[PDB]
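Q: A reviewer asked whether we had any structural model of the full assembly, not just the individual parts. We don't, so I'm hoping you can provide one. Inputs are below.
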Amino acid sequence: YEHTAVMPNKVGIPYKALVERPGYAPVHLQIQLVNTRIIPSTNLEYITC
Amino acid sequence: YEHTAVMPNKVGIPYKALVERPGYAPVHLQIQLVNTRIIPSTNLEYITCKYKTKVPSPVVKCCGATQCTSKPHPDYQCQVFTGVYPFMWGGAYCFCDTENTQMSEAYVERSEECSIDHAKAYKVHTGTVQAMVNITYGSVSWRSADVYVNGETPAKIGDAKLIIGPLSSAWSPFDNKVVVYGHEVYNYDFPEYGTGKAGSFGDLQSRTSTSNDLYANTNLKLQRPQAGIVHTPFTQAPSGFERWKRDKGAPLNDVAPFGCSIALEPLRAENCAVGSIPISIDIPDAAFTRISETPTVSDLECKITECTYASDFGGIATVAYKSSKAGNCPIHSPSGVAVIKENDVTLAESGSFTFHFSTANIHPAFKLQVCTSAVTCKGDCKPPKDHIVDYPAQHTESFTWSWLKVLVGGTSAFIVLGLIATAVVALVLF
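A: Here is a predicted structure for the entire assembly that you could use as a starting point for your response.
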């Protein structure tokens, strides 16, 4: 039942998928990507002023 | 109503057949062959074990010979020796120098471990298999009785009389010749009592532990002690019981076929799931309910709702029960396609109650006999995901058409088209 799901990157809205496990009752999702903060790899090269 | 039934030999799962006695209400079975312990006919041929060269203390005649004799000890190796000068606590003690004689003698004897840590050969015949068959019968709900397989033995434990077998699957997982060790059982061609080559298995061969006589081919060869000192060179193969514990073969409870377990206990081979058993029971007629007291259920409907194409009882199906009275109703699928967890279903006045089951065909078209009312619970099933735990309840695999029916009918249609092309040439011909 490991519910793989392609999923649009968009922040402020849930994505209520559905678990179709064969055998037991299905269960809904509610996946809201509340944030997409990134934090790339960087380097402080020089301050200027 | 003596309900004959062919029945698969498989241990840990009930076999809920249905008594179709004409006249009174049917009753379900629940026949779980909890065990298939075998206990073939056997013979203790010889214990073996590792020797112990329990040397009798050699003679030392100081000036002249001491002829040895062949004492009757097992493998009594004895060889006179001269040319010694035996250093014993005061330097030597025998005042001669070549007439100093030393007679070494050594015989083979059972170890103290032979009593307890010992391999054990057998000539193994077939004997007669057994079982602690539980039946939580009908409304009786219990009997856990030990039975046989030979097809005229009853066992009136509980209230029912039941005759089992003989099974058709005569594979004794034991071979003819077997060695046995503590718990690990080896279907080994042990050489024999009285013969075993030294070093090889059965260098020591005692009939039993008590048996003072034995056969000890150990190749025990005494050599002369060195440089005028008292001791006893015994040159000997360490036992074929020493090896056979670290250059052995694997155990029959780890190499057998058709699914058996083993014990150093009555020499059974438990739970050998193979073939079928023609089982037949004489129920107590008192346990029957007359037909006019169970609700008649017809004018019903059955349908799966989530069929699981699987082993565990994942298949389910509601049934639009249409009863006359209200009460219990034993159930069974006379077709072996579907195996059902529920033997009995309670009924109000024409309600509905789902049961559980398991199947093996994508389109389970199995009849369901709800206390004298048949119904097809046709439908379609889904494969599971999670298959690593013990053994199934389904045990009904067979042949299981989406490109075969009109395919092969279409395949035929080419060659069916032939003899309606040919012999119409005969018409065009005339």
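A: Points you may want to mention in the reply: The radius of gyration of chain B is 36 Å. The longest strand of chain B covers residues 301-308.
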